Amino acid sequence: GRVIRNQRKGAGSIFTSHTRLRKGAAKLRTLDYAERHGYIRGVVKQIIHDPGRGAPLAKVAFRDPYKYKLREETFIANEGVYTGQFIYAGKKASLNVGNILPLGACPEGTIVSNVEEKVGDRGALGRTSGNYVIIIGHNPDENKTRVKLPSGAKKIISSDARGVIGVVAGGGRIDKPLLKAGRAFHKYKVKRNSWPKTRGVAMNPVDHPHGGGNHQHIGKASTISRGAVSGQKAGLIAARRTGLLRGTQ
Amino acid sequence: TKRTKKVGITGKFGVRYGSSLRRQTKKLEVQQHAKYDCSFCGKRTVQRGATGIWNCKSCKKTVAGGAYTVSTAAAATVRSTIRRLRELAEA
RNA sequence: CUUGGAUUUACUGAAGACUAACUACUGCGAAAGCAUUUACCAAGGACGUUUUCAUUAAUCAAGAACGAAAGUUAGGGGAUC
RNA sequence: AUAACUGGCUUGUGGCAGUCAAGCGUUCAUAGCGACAUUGCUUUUUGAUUCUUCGAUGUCGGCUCUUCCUAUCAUACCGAAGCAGAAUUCGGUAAGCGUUGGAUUGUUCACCCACUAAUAGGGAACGUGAGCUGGGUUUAGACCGUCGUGAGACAGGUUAGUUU
RNA sequence: GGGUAAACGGCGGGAGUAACUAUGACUCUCUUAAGGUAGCCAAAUGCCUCGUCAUCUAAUUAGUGACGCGCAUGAAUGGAUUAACGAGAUUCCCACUGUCCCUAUCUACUAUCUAGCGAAACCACAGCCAAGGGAACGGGCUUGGCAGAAUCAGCGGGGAAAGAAGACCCUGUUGAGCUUGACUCUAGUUUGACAUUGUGAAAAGACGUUUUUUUACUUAUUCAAUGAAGCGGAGCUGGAGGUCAAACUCCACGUUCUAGCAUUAAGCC
RNA sequence: AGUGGGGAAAGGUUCCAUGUCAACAGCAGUUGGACAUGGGUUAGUCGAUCCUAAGAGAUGGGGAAGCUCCGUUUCAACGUGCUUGAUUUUUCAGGCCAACCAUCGAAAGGGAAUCCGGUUAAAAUUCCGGAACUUGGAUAUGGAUUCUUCACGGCAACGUAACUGAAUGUGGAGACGUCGGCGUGAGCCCUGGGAGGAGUUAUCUUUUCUUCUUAACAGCUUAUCACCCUGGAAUUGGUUUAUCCGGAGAUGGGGUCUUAUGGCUGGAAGAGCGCGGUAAUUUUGCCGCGUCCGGUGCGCUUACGACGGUCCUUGAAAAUCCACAGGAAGGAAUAGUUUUCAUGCCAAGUCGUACUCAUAACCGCAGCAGGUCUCCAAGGUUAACAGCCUCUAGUUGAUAGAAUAAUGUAGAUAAGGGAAGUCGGCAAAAUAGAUCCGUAACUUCGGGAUAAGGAUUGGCUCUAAGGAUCGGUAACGAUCAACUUAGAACUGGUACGGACAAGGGGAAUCUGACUGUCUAAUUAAAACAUAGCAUUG
RNA sequence: AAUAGGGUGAAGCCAGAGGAAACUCUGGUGGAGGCUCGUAGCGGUUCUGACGUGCAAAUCGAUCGUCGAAUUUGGGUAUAGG
Numbered sequence A: 001g002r003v004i005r006n007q008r009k010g011a012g013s014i015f016t017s018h019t020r021l022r023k024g025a026a027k028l029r030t031l032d033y034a035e036r037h038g039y040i041r042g043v044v045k046q047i048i049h050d051p052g053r054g055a056p057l058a059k060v061a062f063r064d065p066y067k068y069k070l071r072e073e074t075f076i077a078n079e080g081v082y083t084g085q086f087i088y089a090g091k092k093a094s095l096n097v098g099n100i101l102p103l104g105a106c107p108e109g110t111i112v113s114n115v116e117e118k119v120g121d122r123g124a125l126g127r128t129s130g131n132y133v134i135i136i137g138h139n140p141d142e143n144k145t146r147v148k149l150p151s152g153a154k155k156i157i158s159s160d161a162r163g164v165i166g167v168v169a170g171g172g173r174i175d176k177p178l179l180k181a182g183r184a185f186h187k188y189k190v191k192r193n194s195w196p197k198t199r200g201v202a203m204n205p206v207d208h209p210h211g212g213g214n215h216q217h218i219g220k221a222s223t224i225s226r227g228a229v230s231g232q233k234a235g236l237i238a239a240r241r242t243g244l245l246r247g248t249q
Numbered sequence B: 001t002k003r004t005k006k007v008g009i010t011g012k013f014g015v016r017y018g019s020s021l022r023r024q025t026k027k028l029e030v031q032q033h034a035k036y037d038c039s040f041c042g043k044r045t046v047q048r049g050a051t052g053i054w055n056c057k058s059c060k061k062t063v064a065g066g067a068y069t070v071s072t073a074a075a076a077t078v079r080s081t082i083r084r085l086r087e088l089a090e091a
Numbered sequence C: 001c002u003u004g005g006a007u008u009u010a011c012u013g014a015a016g017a018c019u020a021a022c023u024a025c026u027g028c029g030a031a032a033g034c035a036u037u038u039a040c041c042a043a044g045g046a047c048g049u050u051u052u053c054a055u056u057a058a059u060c061a062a063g064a065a066c067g068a069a070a071g072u073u074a075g076g077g078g079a080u081c
Numbered sequence D: 001a002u003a004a005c006u007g008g009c010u011u012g013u014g015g016c017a018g019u020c021a022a023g024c025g026u027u028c029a030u031a032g033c034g035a036c037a038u039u040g041c042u043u044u045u046u047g048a049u050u051c052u053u054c055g056a057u058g059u060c061g062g063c064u065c066u067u068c069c070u071a072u073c074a075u076a077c078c079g080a081a082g083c084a085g086a087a088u089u090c091g092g093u094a095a096g097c098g099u100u101g102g103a104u105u106g107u108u109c110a111c112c113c114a115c116u117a118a119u120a121g122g123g124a125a126c127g128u129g130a131g132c133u134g135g136g137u138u139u140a141g142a143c144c145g146u147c148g149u150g151a152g153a154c155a156g157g158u159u160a161g162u163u164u
Numbered sequence E: 001g002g003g004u005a006a007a008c009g010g011c012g013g014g015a016g017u018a019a020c021u022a023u024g025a026c027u028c029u030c031u032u033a034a035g036g037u038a039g040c041c042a043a044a045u046g047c048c049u050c051g052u053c054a055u056c057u058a059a060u061u062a063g064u065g066a067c068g069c070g071c072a073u074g075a076a077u078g079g080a081u082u083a084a085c086g087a088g089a090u091u092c093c094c095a096c097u098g099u100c101c102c103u104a105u106c107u108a109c110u111a112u113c114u115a116g117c118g119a120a121a122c123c124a125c126a127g128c129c130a131a132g133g134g135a136a137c138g139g140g141c142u143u144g145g146c147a148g149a150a151u152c153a154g155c156g157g158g159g160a161a162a163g164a165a166g167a168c169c170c171u172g173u174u175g176a177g178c179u180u181g182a183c184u185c186u187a188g189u190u191u192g193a194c195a196u197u198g199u200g201a202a203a204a205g206a207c208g209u210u211u212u213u214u215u216a217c218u219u220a221u222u223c224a225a226u227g228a229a230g231c232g233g234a235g236c237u238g239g240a241g242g243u244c245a246a247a248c249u250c251c252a253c254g255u256u257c258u259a260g261c262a263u264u265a266a267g268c269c
Numbered sequence F: 001a002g003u004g005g006g007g008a009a010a011g012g013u014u015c016c017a018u019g020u021c022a023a024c025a026g027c028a029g030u031u032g033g034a035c036a037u038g039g040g041u042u043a044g045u046c047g048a049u050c051c052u053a054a055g056a057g058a059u060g061g062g063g064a065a066g067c068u069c070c071g072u073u074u075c076a077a078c079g080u081g082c083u084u085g086a087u088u089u090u091u092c093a094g095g096c097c098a099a100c101c102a103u104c105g106a107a108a109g110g111g112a113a114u115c116c117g118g119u120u121a122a123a124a125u126u127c128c129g130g131a132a133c134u135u136g137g138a139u140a141u142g143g144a145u146u147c148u149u150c151a152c153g154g155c156a157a158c159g160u161a162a163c164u165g166a167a168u169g170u171g172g173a174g175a176c177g178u179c180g181g182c183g184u185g186a187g188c189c190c191u192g193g194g195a196g197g198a199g200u201u202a203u204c205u206u207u208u209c210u211u212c213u214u215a216a217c218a219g220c221u222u223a224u225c226a227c228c229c230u231g232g233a234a235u236u237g238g239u240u241u242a243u244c245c246g247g248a249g250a251u252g253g254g255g256u257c258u259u260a261u262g263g264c265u266g267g268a269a270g271a272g273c274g275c276g277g278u279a280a281u282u283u284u285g286c287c288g289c290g291u292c293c294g295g296u297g298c299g300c301u302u303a304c305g306a307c308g309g310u311c312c313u314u315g316a317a318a319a320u321c322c323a324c325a326g327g328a329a330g331g332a333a334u335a336g337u338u339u340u341c342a343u344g345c346c347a348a349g350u351c352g353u354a355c356u357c358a359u360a361a362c363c364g365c366a367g368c369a370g371g372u373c374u375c376c377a378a379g380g381u382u383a384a385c386a387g388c389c390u391c392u393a394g395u396u397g398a399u400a401g402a403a404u405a406a407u408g409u410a411g412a413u414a415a416g417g418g419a420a421g422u423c424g425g426c427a428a429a430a431u432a433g434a435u436c437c438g439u440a441a442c443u444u445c446g447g448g449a450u451a452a453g454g455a456u457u458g459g460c461u462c463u464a465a466g467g468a469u470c471g472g473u474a475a476c477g478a479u480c481a482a483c484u485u486a487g488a489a490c491u492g493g494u495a496c497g498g499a500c501a502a503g504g505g506g507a508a509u510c511u512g513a514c515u516g517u518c519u520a521a522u523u524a525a526a527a528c529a530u531a532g533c534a535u536u537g
Numbered sequence G: 001a002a003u004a005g006g007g008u009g010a011a012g013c014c015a016g017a018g019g020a021a022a023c024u025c026u027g028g029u030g031g032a033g034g035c036u037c038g039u040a041g042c043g044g045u046u047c048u049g050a051c052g053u054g055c056a057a058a059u060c061g062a063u064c065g066u067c068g069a070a071u072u073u074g075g076g077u078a079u080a081g082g
């Protein structure tokens, strides 16, 4: 047969992300002395649209502690943050929307976003519009905090890892239907080349494991082992179950 | 005169996409294009620029918000929850 | 279902419901209904009045508000039955 | 050296014709029929075979047009009758002359409607594609049903498909 | 051994039974993982089949509506609908007309003839018929009919005319595209051992050394950040813990109404 | 919306003049993109050159037997740094810093600066004549500034001829989608008077046609928006075609700013144009006069402005230039500045530049009915940049002559019938614009719908309605002006969307929801995609 | 970089009418849409038309689909033979 579309994506030729119009990577400030021991104050200059991202971003200006120079930062804007607001980041930052605090300084049930997995990686968790991380409990002796991720998973993180108070803005995008192929076209026009999607059963056997036959059908189980090799993993990879989910989970 | 009985703003879609899909769009598009009261200057001049971005044409202040409304229910709950946890901690 | 220890014992914890006992020939509400604490919001019957208006009223086709449970749509929850 | 047309041999099968005469026909085998048997003919069916053609004979039907056969549907003349007349039936010489218009089907075939003197059957490389047409069949696109794990299969159905 | 079908897929027979008959609500039995549910249908899916009935027509293997033991319908291998849309398939009707009855006439450009210019396909030799025999359909051979130069415009009977070493079929110990529970392997991936690979402790084992389990160290090694900027320890200040010896624990140690400013040190010894 | 006038790609001398006809231009040839001999392409201002884009790619390095692969925010001791007080001793001395930056990548993106007239056989925003501009440098003069050292004025928005400002920091410009109506300007179109010239003239047309123009650049001036001062608002007012604005200060009154765009003047009438005359076998002319004053708009195109809509889409980068914050340093009195005020001086390199841009200069074997990116755009009819006729400009190229049989190809018409033809209405016919009337089932309430189906339409002569600017119950008078709509009379071989242009419709079934997409060269579909739905990691 | 001229008439806005009320109705304005008729453009249905030793190794005529977006297109750039 032939190399399937799955396999062709990894060479990254026509499948690289479309980044010309993007407004910069969204990150927290690097952990420095000020955020480790006290707090530092910045001001929101702009709240802007980032193409390919549902959540708006905030450009925030901070003084450089060590030389006469301004520093601009690209944050993920939480809902309620506004231009001209002061943003406090550090260990002594107050518990207000938009402030960047370590997770150890937030009581049970604090809603937080753009949360670090490891201390100082500048944010990995709860970054999309309408999403957030819940703080479940504290383990002060071990310096570990337990949090609830958007997917429902529970995770133990260092209490020195930071997060931003509030909910990521722009929530509710998916509530409105797209209604049109053209809206999807415009959506992925600034993300990557992954649309439209041809069905594997509509192809010939060279093109895809699902192709061929005098009727369109898969012909073998679409649940594929985790240990299958590239070119075989099309369908439902390592599925624990299939079919309509009924009841609770 | 009342030009359309029920389609409202989704009259631009004609007879396409199905009535349920158009009716679901109507609920969010009315909120999307509505004027909101600014919490800073007190005028009804807040409109959406893009998803999650709400500008006031009067005082020129932009606040991050929801995709189709200025404030979502989850964000409102967080303000009270963050308000509450703030004083229970500072006391 | 259980020797992979089920059931039973103690501690901590997580969920959603529900509001026992007090509770009655007792209360309120147009009816459907309404039962943990507290605070706020506006509403109400009765009573008391040497206050006020002066027939403004009764019942009502048409036309409207509310309306257990079950059932429907979309989210969220989904312990128990 | 070998199948799928035509052609050739064959003629079971198909079609057509005889001989005998048990019975039918109010009695009367033979006007008209004709069982049980039995002799043939034809190549307008389908087989059997594999002789010719695989450095290719354009492979359905229709349309168009000519001609030929006779085992004669009509028309000419006549013989027979269980021929009173009328109508009808059997038979002879006869192919000179004609043998139609439509609904459904790609159809040959089939089946109805109607007209007509009559609406006979056949051949000519299953006449006729450098005459057409291209509905069907019979490349590649696509759908369904059954079958197959699958790729795919199906004298099963369906739609689109360059005629030098 | 457990779960999973909006995974691949699958979704039954045989007997009897109602007071005319017929049918069978009802019963028995065999059997499955389950025995096709809601719907839908001679449908683009039904062989039989041009199914049967009705409608449409003078007449309908077409169309439509019904019926359903359905060769072999059927539920995201999606079922049944469905307004709007369609150079999609199909039937009927109105309008329309040379599609036809049944053909006629007209125009331009060709064809035609001329001056000039001037190819190609194809070609064993060639070129009138009937019969015969013959590789079983001859231009040539045998026997007949016959048979007179040179030619022009047309024509599509024949030259089994031309175009291409049949694309169908079969053979070949010739392939190739594709598939899989074919034979034989393979990238990847996973699992163990050994090496990289050092320094301790406790507890179970077996003859001062050793097997196993856990857990301690940091310098090998691995991950990450940075323009390698504030690390580790101690101390100076305060505050709380009521101290009692005596300074013993813990905490902090310059920035939070506001979209300003902070850079090239003052001061002191 | 060209058979007109230019260009990009591609070609490469095909350009022009002279000569020439063997071959080539499928006839011809005295002609030619042919053949031969010569000539021809002039830049500080137009491009390239520079910048960065997607991307490409060296370098300490890490792989690979290696050709080489990987990395460029690259585990690196990475400046061939910069500014001073000067020293010339071609030596010094300090002080600032080094986050980023090898390099390549656009003749349509970004970007310093030029116009008009004339001129050749063939070049011109390149030459000539005149008039400007930019950048870099040098530097003199004047002006400005200083005894209150680094200017004044205005309540303010801010104004000006100038009117110190190091490191460092910051801001702006460069620099950005798309659609809708509205406003303004320019060019074009239309139009009156007058001054010339041409035409028609049997008759007539105060007539038919034509000329009457004004660059870059310099000065003054000129604006929507925005902003400032005053003042303090419900009897809410102002206000757009589009409903937004006002105690966060409206309406009213008075000012400030951007100069897009227009006006006047200089450039500049000396040019160009139109008439008339004259020398002359003439190079090249020389002279006279004029070249003026208005109107109009749902016109066309184009630029700009103020607005409004739209997105699960929010619509480059860099070079480069400016400004600000800062307060280092240096500056006065009988004296330092600054070339961001005026004037003056010097210079601007390299390569491209002819021509074609196509029914003959490119690619398709060729002078091939194919293919190949883009700018400008007149009158009439009209909704119209469609179709039809015309002006400017350009062609008149495609072998020709004589005839007009059959069969063709392209196009027409046909009595009566009206799909009987055929697999099938294939093909053809029928319908068609605009105004008014009328419009079913069904439906996702949006549609279906131009459903179906009727009536009307010419010409001529009239009438009515819809405005602008001036001037004080001005409900008026005056002056001016665009075509829309409506009605009436009269009239004709009943014609009239008179050519052109221009839907046939209805009742159902199957199927895919829809718009969209593919088998370049036999299949456009019911196939693919799609939104929606579900499952998996 | 490019895309005549029409039709329909979505939200928003103004004005009026009806009603006891809840509410309802009308006339304008506006100018939405992978809306529609239809040029240029892009495509390629049918005649199974022409041609089929062609003008042409895919063309020519008519008839057609679509025509403001999943639109058309120049140049630059990336992806390379199991």
Ligand SMILES: CN[C@@H]1[C@@H](O)[C@@H](O[C@@H]2[C@@H](O)[C@H](O[C@H]3O[C@H]([C@@H](C)O)[C@@H](O)[C@H](O)[C@H]3N)[C@@H](N)C[C@H]2N)OC[C@]1(C)O
Binding pocket: D119
């Ligand atoms: C012109 N229409 C005709 C119609 O007339 C009719 O034709 C038949 C024809 O088919 C019959 O013929 C048919 O039937 C005979 C049989 C009866 O013997 C067969 O032998 C013959 O092969 C067959 N074609 C012929 N015997 C009479 C015509 N009217 O049926 C056929 C038709 C086309 O519809």
Ligand SMILES: CN[C@@H]1[C@@H](O)[C@@H](O[C@@H]2[C@@H](O)[C@H](O[C@H]3O[C@H]([C@@H](C)O)[C@@H](O)[C@H](O)[C@H]3N)[C@@H](N)C[C@H]2N)OC[C@]1(C)O
Binding pocket: F075
């Ligand atoms: C055991 N030796 C290690 C040696 O391997 C190495 O460590 C690198 C480290 O330098 C890299 O990290 C480095 O390089 C990355 C780059 C790859 O993007 C940089 O982004 C990063 O700033 C830089 N610290 C890290 N990403 C991997 C380690 N093995 O250097 C550190 C070391 C201790 O010598």
Ligand SMILES: CN[C@@H]1[C@@H](O)[C@@H](O[C@@H]2[C@@H](O)[C@H](O[C@H]3O[C@H]([C@@H](C)O)[C@@H](O)[C@H](O)[C@H]3N)[C@@H](N)C[C@H]2N)OC[C@]1(C)O
Binding pocket: E176, G081, G082
């Ligand atoms: C499934 N087996 C195939 C096997 O058949 C074969 O494939 C060849 C392929 O390699 C050939 O192709 C070869 O030659 C061609 C060309 C020069 O002819 C090249 O373009 C190509 O690079 C070269 N690999 C191709 N022409 C035929 C296939 N069957 O090669 C091995 C294989 C890919 O595994």
Ligand SMILES: [Zn+2]
Binding pocket: B038, B039, B040, B041, B042, B043, B045, B056, B057, B058, B059, B060, B061
């Ligand atoms: Zn505001």
